[PDB]
Design a protein around this ligand. Structure first.
Ligand SMILES: [Sr+2]
Length: 303
């Protein structure tokens, strides 16, 4: 921590306008939003017309550089259903202007790599979903209840999760498209299922300098969380407890409160780099969920 929080408001959608909703967010400077006369400050606040490129530049581009220096990292999208999480994390996957964080990260990683001579790179990706605290491999639909374990050096791993070596951004994008298709298997209503489950995309960048033999490894987890809007989702409550513990400098961090936070243990907090993008509707209709989303983001404020 090493945890940054950035708030992204989207425009009102046509359904909110058809209902007669009002735009209730006000902005001060670049880092504060006011709701019902209360200010909420973050590392950055994105207004409703912020482009995909600006969001990537502020939220993710530095973390990509760090992963290529051998750090681990995580980027989360958090917020109520329809607040813009998937538009932020994925966008229009193949459109140069509309693409989201994930395809831009893939582009930058490979462009950086192409720009290196004595360095040798190995890139691996995995893609899974957490639904009801159960891990399902999006690259192998026969693997639906995977367990979390620790290795001998104590690094977490998902036992038996598919790993795919990739050598081009199009290979990565093809892998994401395959996972999105496989996600439909044994699922009645995809849209509802997606809003109630977490998708986790892992990119593992390993490198060795062949003339000095130094090796570096970095893992970047990209997480599109379930809707935060009767219980709080178990992964989300675990995530809040972990962020709050890190924010107060606690020696003990309760990663074991969920499978998701156990998986991310070496890529969330400590020496790892993290950005949480909280996504919000500006609608008067969603005011109390927006308040709750902003309060979740303030968990990261260091005390
Ligand atoms: Sr869950």
């Amino acid at each position: 921590s090493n945890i940054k929080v950035m708030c992204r408001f989207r425009p009102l959608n046509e359904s909110e306008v058809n209902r007669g909703d009002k735009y209730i967010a006000k902005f001060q400077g670049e880092d504060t939003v006011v709701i019902a006369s209360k200010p909420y400050a973050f590392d950055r606040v994105f207004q409703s017309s912020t482009s995909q490129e600006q969001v990537y530049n502020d939220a993710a581009k530095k973390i990509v550089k760090d992963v290529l220096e051998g750090y681990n990292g995580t980027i989360f999208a958090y917020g109520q259903t329809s607040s813009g999480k998937t538009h932020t994390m994925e966008g229009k996957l193949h459109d140069p202007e509309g693409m989201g964080i994930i395809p831009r990260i893939v582009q930058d990683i490979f462009n950086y790599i192409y720009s290196m001579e004595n360095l040798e790179f190995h890139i691996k990706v995995s893609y899974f979903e957490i639904y009801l605290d159960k891990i399902r491999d999006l690259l192998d639909v026969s693997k639906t209840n995977l367990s979390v374990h620790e290795d001998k050096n104590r690094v977490p791993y998902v036992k038996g999760a598919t790993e795919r070596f990739v050598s081009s951004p199009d290979e990565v994008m093809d892998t994401i498209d395959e996972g999105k298709s496989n996600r439909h298997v044994a699922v009645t209503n995809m849209n509802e299922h997606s809003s109630r489950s977490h998708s986790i995309f892992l990119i593992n960048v390993k490198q060795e300098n062949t003339q000095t033999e130094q090796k570096l490894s970095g893992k970047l987890y990209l997480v599109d969380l379930a809707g935060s809007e009767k219980n709080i989702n178990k992964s989300l409550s675990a995530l809040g407890n972990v962020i709050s513990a890190l924010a107060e400098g606690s020696t003990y961090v309760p990663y074991r409160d969920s499978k998701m936070t156990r998986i991310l243990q070496d890529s969330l907090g400590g020496n790892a780099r993290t950005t949480i993008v909280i996504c919000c509707s500006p609608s008067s209709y969603n005011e109390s969920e927006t308040k709750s989303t902003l309060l979740f983001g303030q968990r990261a404020k260091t005390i």
